[PDB]
Design a protein around this ligand. Structure first.
Ligand SMILES: *C(=O)CCCCCCCCCCCCC
Ligand SMILES: *C(=O)CCCCCCCCCCCCC
Lengths: 604, 41, 109, 604, 604, 41
């Protein structure tokens, strides 16, 4: 049973309506199921432990028995009259609301009390590493004590109550074994209150540490089910939400990104220059679109973000072409009639809006750093919005210069300030971008081995690629973490892949002389580096031309392997290299024993 | 370390005590008590 | 046996590989050193010439090796050990096992 | 009850003193509460499973019953005489210390044993993905077997014991259903020992996966309470400790950062040059402070860190002004009399200490990379300390050049090596920095919408801004993760904000014609992108001029929403887009069924 | 007991062999141990809660009692005949397979049902932050309701069932206290079904929050045992696997990295130029090895990776030396006879392979960005493999230019395209690299204070240094997180170190006048910044010349302290600064009360 | 796959076995056993 206890308000006959939460002057009795007593007992148990320090310091008020907050009522206990009717409990143990209040504020008040002392006990305890993980190692007690008698700073609490803290301590450190009163010798065994827990944390030499290897697994299992690593290369529309894209604002360096390497950025590849004009704040400036191709951020295929083009440390040659100086650098949109990459001359450019200029010309924004005047780090920045560009077939964001007077000097300059580190930040997660279009769902499998070397590094913050990369990256840490894809152990991961290579290379051999019986020693090893190359750089699985990894099978395969692989690790997964791991722990205890030996001499 | 006597069953400077870690019993109280909503009830 | 106190490593020490990660302040090659020179079909002096330096690297302060060299006399035992002189070698029970040896002086230096 | 068992040492009458931990020749009996038997049973259960492999290989020693390590003593069981008195347990089940040792080293020894086999079983099991997540899919057993008879490398253990591993396997993979002996047909149902657990992990088509959606929530709940996301925009002094700043060493590019964009960096904006001198290692060099403003790291407002100015790949024009070559580049402090930004000429600069020079002039540190000789990557580096600058009102760290002989050539150069990538690393977490002052506590709400675009990116490693950014970043991953702030589901997050916008826009309408009744469809949508823009780039909420996000309400609001939102997710939160998610899983099982079909033909 | 139930197939006498899994027409009865009923009850409990909404909307089908899926069989219940023999259970409660199916698909079907409604209830609930964390704060109900009557968008479900959702709600939000029917007033206490859980999550003013502080500890404990932070500075060979290196592809900028600062990169420091030739694709090009030293990636000491040298934004002076234009930039290997750094002239260079050229000369790859033509972002890229360089003592990877015709113009150019951002990605984790050699195991302690300032930042992706950095980094977040290494609390971490400094400085004082009695106030403070400097920048502990941190003791010491420190935190660790933390929470509730006050007026 | 016979209740090459995954029962053993200090006791 569970929930609050109910009782037949109509008396005797208890039906699915003659019940009612048995409330009263104390609040409502909620049932205390077996396991929920484990907690409140485990919590109180950790407080009772500090008994010797509560009396010493006259705080506290006696040991806290959980049997002081409960009661022994009886009735039907459920979550609702209907279902509570199927849990007739007699003399169960319930805790009334007003009590659920004290057991709370008591464990809270006492928790402070101890939390404090417990902190002093520690700066003194750990102040001599009472924990080794291979074999033993003593340190003659006299010295030890006479030593901490020093180190411990005058405001601890282990100097005001030595054997009032010691008695608390003995129950937390199975290192300190108190000398028995009637034989005046230790005990071999150490009996700290955490008897079992402390036994099951020792780094057992057979397998690393059960508490470790156990969690590193349940931890990975969490992720595997959580983010949705499963279904990682699913071939079908998936809401961007399914990718929980967060804290995702990637930055670049356009005016370098080739147009074909990333759809969201077209260029004005035209013969001559395209000097246009525009009255901005009265003054008339001339946008240039200089000698080179001047790659500009396209506006369509640009998920309403927060574009913030930073222009700093980048050269600013106002020294040579004086034409450049005087011009306030500024991010400006450019609506063109004919599609760009077909826009020849000025009459082609519909209009030009200065979405964000920089007050003060190019001769205050400068700063000489050895001849080559740089740009004082400043951030121009628009706030592009999907629909502010409705209808408008062609429009481009360009972080240019806005020259107040074009001249012969700036005839080979080309004032694109795009060489600066632009940082787009998708401000509306629901919508992603792929191959130049804005969508609401991705098709994972499509984005695999479909980008090129740099059609990946040139991805646009929160676009399929960047999403089908953030995803693999989780799955990449589950294998990297739990599974042993980094040793000659032909693990579950590199194993799922090997079975694909076989089934694959086996049918490609079917029909024709079949002169080559499948290899296997070579297949195991080829798939080992395939699974390994993945854990290594999760990204690669997106680039066209990557051995194994990019065939449709793998990944879809890998994950579902790694999947079941985590759901069976056992507990002693740590047996892997638990030999050198062990031998390394003994190595430490031998060096730490060496320490105790000095504590033992210096302070005799 | 001044002698106490009864407050607690053990004297610190008491006869034949012994600091001596054993890789076998890693000292530990109770920190990870579960209280999260679903798990506490 | 308690892992900390007793450790066991497989594979021969004659092979360079085996010596990776095995550090002991003292080694003892009694009853083996002779069989290794024979097994690795190598000269006795040349063998320990590569073993001693490994023990030094292994981090060894002391060494004890049951080497088989005629330091007292080149005289042999009729049934226990024959000392073939054409090739520095022994014959414990003439045949049962043959293991190369060194000389007191050459091996000493 | 819990803890070690005690018994009346004084006999009969058991008072709060006539007790005593019942120790003896076996150690101390510690009680084995109901739940703690669940673990040791669940641990042993996972070992017994491997019974068929223990006999096959003559290891093991029979099945391990947990009832072999316990006993049936009876007495009072608590943590201390006082509280143990309230837990009279009769014939409880306790495990003695020496036993708590075996149940430990047994589960450890056996755990190794199985951990090994269990690894072989796997490279063979996952080596044919026995796990699908939508509908079924078989693969005629003959083929399957005759297939793995191949792939599996000659050193497995599934080839030496086929149906000795198979029997272990059948209990772990409800995929392999053994053919019943007396009807020689499968069973429809699959009965693996993990009957329930395996049932509750299947990706249930109604809602993603209970095991997933459940954890992704408890996981987020952990963080929410842990780091202290709650109280994220609290308006009142908070110890830096409350922000657990760790692994926090940010790097820049000064000599670019404007002085007003980041208080910790002032500049010598003076008319002419300020050539000073200083005997460093005998030789007399001249610090320049050349033509431009030469931005220098201020020393006050500089949390005793580890400044490490790297100067590499950056230009080094010793080719033109020969004056530059011969000068050993070096980070040097500069104490000025009159405050900088008021320091006109040499007589103003008190002294200049070469805190770290680079041995060998500027013509060995070079390296030609196409005409423009660069700087061989080298790191100069001081270790500034709060108090080494006590009293000293003005002092600045400057990574300049130290020219051995100033000339006309270096009259427009300005040797500030600050254009290099400097990396400050706060070496003393307790102290933070804000607006130019060093403090011990932040006031969160103060740092919101108080920085400018770049008064953020120019923050100083472990300063309020960088702390009130590391914090939002956690809270940003809790929403990004748990809450669905990335779909049209007007989630709890974007909902907490909408209620603020209403209450806000509603009172701004009070008093005056109230010609505009609040919108709502427009408010919901405006707050959706506000909560969304946050998850996106957590930082923004610090920059002055960000719509919604920067009003005092939000955040303080958001978090406390997201807060309660996680504490109610239910379990089936995965119902979100659990339709396409499902349809994608069926998509995979259809492709994986396609695989089994080849395994089924190729290897008949 | 646990597992499926068995019964004596041979009847009466059960011999451990007679027992057989009692299967049948329903599947196999698996035992439902005490705790496993807690879950299925806790799951069903959370569904019954929504009872009022199931009837309202005619879905559901009555309350789900867990006692409808189980049974009361009796027999022996274990994991295998052998061990099941020691668990004779009478009238235990087992759930048959076919049932374990419904309790599953029911909780799944119902879970969807509620997951939906439960989402509507929320957008309305959190839409008025029903959760404060200090003191109270009301908001006159009328207003509140009449308010949400607005905000809530027309497609919720809290408008179609107000007090059908309200009744569900009252059990989840102890904020909404329903007015009692027969006294028509609230209740003071609030009785939500989560009575206890909700009591134990409140931010108790004594210590932050038990649910928080508790997890932040168990969380850290997980890591500490997991990754293997323990043994962090172990002095002995450790398989790279023990470091779970994943998602690890670091990028650089060679042609800058000094050869001695990173073994994996040697340079051709020769007097004149070394123009060689090579027929690549018919056309004959000349590799240059120009004026400067031209640092090239060495091939040995290069873990078979995926080298991808990006050349973008970097200068391309085809404007001056016309010689440069026309030459297709390309990454090329260079096998030399005599070892490099001893290779004088052309006859020395064995051969030169163009492992990856860039189609199209240097005058299409350009792009004018203000005079200085840059490189259109493109990625050349080899796939170096350990053994493809077997035997070959000397061979180097060089991303040079391949000039189609060397001239006088390119006599001081030196076409090394290495100034570009190269990104090596280890494609085979098992093998690491150290000091220039490829290995399979590291020796941690060796890599401490053994690198120089930049012999660290110049590390090669997945090399000991980068591994002994990824490791410290975890341990750095465990302390940063759990332990309070960021306040004057001389924590367990900075305490473990202090004891080393003492024992250390104490013996260095032994022998000789001992004129200086150890300090301690100065030692505590010195070790505090030592432990602090570590949490700060984990890396430092690798660099030669770092105070304290780099002595062999520390770290090996630190961790083992931090270790036991986490295994005792208590629960109320949050007591640290739980004063200002509290005062900040009251600060928020005072501001949130201010909000409710407007909701209370505007919408009267 | 050579016939065994009794060692274990099932032969591998036995009559009518059947590999056949069901999205319903995701295979599973017991990895996440809780042992952390507070939670184990
Ligand atoms: C008398 O108090 C002399 C000092 C000896 C003990 C003081 C505290 C240092 C030793 C701690 C013992 C309890 C657990 C560390
Ligand atoms: C006889 O051993 C022939 C080989 C058939 C089975 C060998 C192992 C491959 C199949 C594994 C079955 C048990 C779980 C995978």
């Amino acid at each position: 049973p569970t929930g609050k206890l109910w009782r037949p308000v109509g008396t005797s006959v208890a039906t699915i309506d003659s019940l009612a939460i048995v409330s009263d002057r104390f609040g409502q009795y909620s049932f205390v199921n077996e396991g929920m007593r484990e907690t409140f007992s485990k919590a109180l148990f950790d407080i009772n432990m500090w008994q010797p320090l509560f009396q010493a310091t006259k705080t506290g008020c006696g040991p806290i028995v959980l049997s002081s907050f409960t009661t022994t009522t009886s009735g039907y206990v459920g979550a609702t009259a209907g279902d509570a009717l199927d849990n007739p409990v007699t003399n169960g143990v319930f805790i009334s609301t007003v009590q659920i209040m004290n057991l709370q504020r008591t464990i809270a008040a006492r928790m402070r009390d101890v939390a404090l002392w417990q902190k002093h006990l520690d700066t003194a305890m750990t102040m001599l590493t009472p924990d080794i993980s291979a074999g033993s190692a003593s340190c003659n007690w006299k010295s030890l004590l006479a030593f901490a008698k020093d180190i411990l700073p005058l405001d601890n609490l282990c100097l005001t109550y030595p054997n009032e803290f010691y008695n608390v301590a003995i129950h937390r450190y199975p290192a300190l074994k108190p000398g028995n009163p009637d034989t005046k010798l230790p005990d071999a065994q150490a009996h700290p209150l955490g008897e079992v827990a402390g036994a099951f944390n020792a780094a057992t030499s057979e397998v690393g540490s059960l508490v470790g290897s156990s969690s590193t697994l349940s931890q990975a299992i969490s992720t595997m089910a959580g983010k949705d690593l499963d279904l990682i290369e699913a071939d079908t529309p998936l809401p961007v939400s399914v990718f929980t894209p967060s804290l995702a604002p990637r930055s670049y360096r356009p005016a370098f990104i080739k147009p074909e390497d990333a759809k969201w950025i077209a260029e004005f590849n035209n013969s001559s220059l395209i000097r246009k004009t525009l009255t901005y704040s009265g003054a008339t400036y001339t946008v240039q679109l200089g000698p080179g191709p001047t790659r500009v951020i396209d506006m369509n295929a640009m998920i309403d973000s927060v574009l913030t083009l930073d222009v700093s440390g980048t050269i600013l040659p106002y020294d040579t072409n004086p034409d450049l100086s005087t011009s306030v650098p500024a991010f400006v949109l450019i609506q063109t009639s004919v599609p760009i990459q077909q826009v020849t001359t000025a009459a082609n450019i519909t209009a030009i809006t200065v979405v964000s200029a920089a007050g003060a010309s190019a001769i205050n924004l400068a700063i000489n750093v050895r001849g080559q005047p740089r740009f004082n780090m400043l951030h121009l920045q628009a706030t592009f919005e999907r629909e502010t560009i409705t209808g408008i077939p062609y429009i481009y964001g360009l972080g240019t210069f806005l020259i107040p007077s074009p001249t012969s000097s700036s005839n080979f300059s080309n004032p694109t300030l795009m060489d600066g580190l632009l940082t787009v930040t998708p401000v509306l997660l629901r919508e992603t971008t792929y191959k130049g279009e804005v969508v609401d769902a991705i098709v994972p499998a499509t984005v695999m081995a479909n980008q090129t070397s740099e059609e990946v590094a040139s991805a646009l913050a929160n676009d399929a690629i960047v999403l089908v990369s953030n995803h693999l990256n989780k799955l990449a840490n589950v294998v990297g973490d739990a599974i042993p894809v980094a040793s000659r152990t032909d693990d579950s991961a590199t194993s799922a892949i090997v079975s694909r290579l076989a089934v694959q290379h086996k049918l490609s051999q079917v029909g024709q002389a079949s002169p080559t019986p499948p290899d296997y020693p070579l297949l195991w090893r080829r798939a080992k580096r395939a699974a390994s190359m993945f854990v290594s750089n999760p990204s690669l699985a997106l680039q066209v031309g990557i051995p194994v990894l990019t065939q449709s099978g793998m990944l879809s395969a890998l994950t579902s392997g790694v999947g079941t692989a985590l759901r069976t690790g056992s507990l002693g997964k740590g047996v892997t290299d638990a030999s050198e791991k062990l031998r390394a722990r003994q190595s430490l205890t031998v060096a730490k024993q060496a320490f105790f030996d000095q504590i033992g001499s210096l302070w005799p | 370390g001044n002698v106490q006597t009864s407050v607690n069953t053990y004297n610190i400077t008491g006869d034949g005590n012994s600091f001596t870690p054993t890789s076998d019993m890693t000292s530990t109280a109770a920190p990870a008590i579960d209280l999260k909503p679903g798990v506490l009830n | 046996f308690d892992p900390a106190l007793t450790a066991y490593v497989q594979g021969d020490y004659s092979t360079a590989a085996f010596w990776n990660g095995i550090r002991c302040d003292s080694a003892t090659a009694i009853f083996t050193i002779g069989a290794a020179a024979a097994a690795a079909g190598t000269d006795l002096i040349a063998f320990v010439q590569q073993l001693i330096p490994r023990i030094v690297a292994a981090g060894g302060t002391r060494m004890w090796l049951q080497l088989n060299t005629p330091l007292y006399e080149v005289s042999s035992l009729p049934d226990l050990i024959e000392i073939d002189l054409r090739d520095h070698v022994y014959r414990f029970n003439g045949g049962e096992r043959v293991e190369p040896y060194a000389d007191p002086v050459p091996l000493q230096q």
